[PDB]
Amino acid sequence: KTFKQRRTFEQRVEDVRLIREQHPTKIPVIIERYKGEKQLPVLDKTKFLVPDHVNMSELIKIIRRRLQLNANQAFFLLVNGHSMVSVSTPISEVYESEKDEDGFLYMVYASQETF
Ligand SMILES: Cc1nsc(N(C)CC(N)=O)c1C#N
Ligand SMILES: [Cl-]
């Protein structure tokens, strides 16, 4: 079901290396709904190429737009399994500290803070 379950470690590593070659200014992001999630819809895709200058606050706005949320629906985004310390950090900086060993940046969203 999950991205990591669908693709071999070798396949995930090779895909990140191709994004490096073909979209060298983009961060490779996996964005998945919490397996428990009742309220929020599923995204149309899993793998996103994020411009490396956008900060986490803007990425949250981007995902809220893509999910077509309204103003009062709650949305919580985990990065690398945990809460974001700050939304002001450029994703280039978040990537260097929070990247997976495969080279993807993993995010999960839910309508509750309690995942
Ligand atoms: C480490 C690394 N990052 S990008 C890359 N490319 C372009 C593909 C490849 N497998 O040669 C490598 C390697 N090595
Ligand atoms: Cl690019």
- Determination technique for this entry: X-ray
- Between the CA of residue 32 and those of 78, 79, 99, what are the distances in Å? 10, 11, 15
CA of 10 to the centre of ligand 2 (A): 23
CA of 36 to the centre of ligand 2 (A): 35
> Which residue's CA is the closest to the ligand 1 atom numbered 14?
17
Domain ranges of the chain: 1-115
CA of 19 to the centre of ligand 2 (A): 8
Own/partner long-range contacts of 27-30 (Cβ < 8 Å, ≥24 apart):
27/51, 27/52, 27/91, 27/92, 27/95, 27/105, 28/103, 28/104, 28/105, 29/59, 29/91, 29/104, 29/105, 29/107, 30/3, 30/104, 30/105, 30/106, 30/107
Q: What is the resolution of this structure in A?
A: 1.9
> Which residue's CA is the closest to the ligand 1 atom numbered 6?
17
> Which residue's CA is the closest to the ligand 1 atom numbered 13?
17
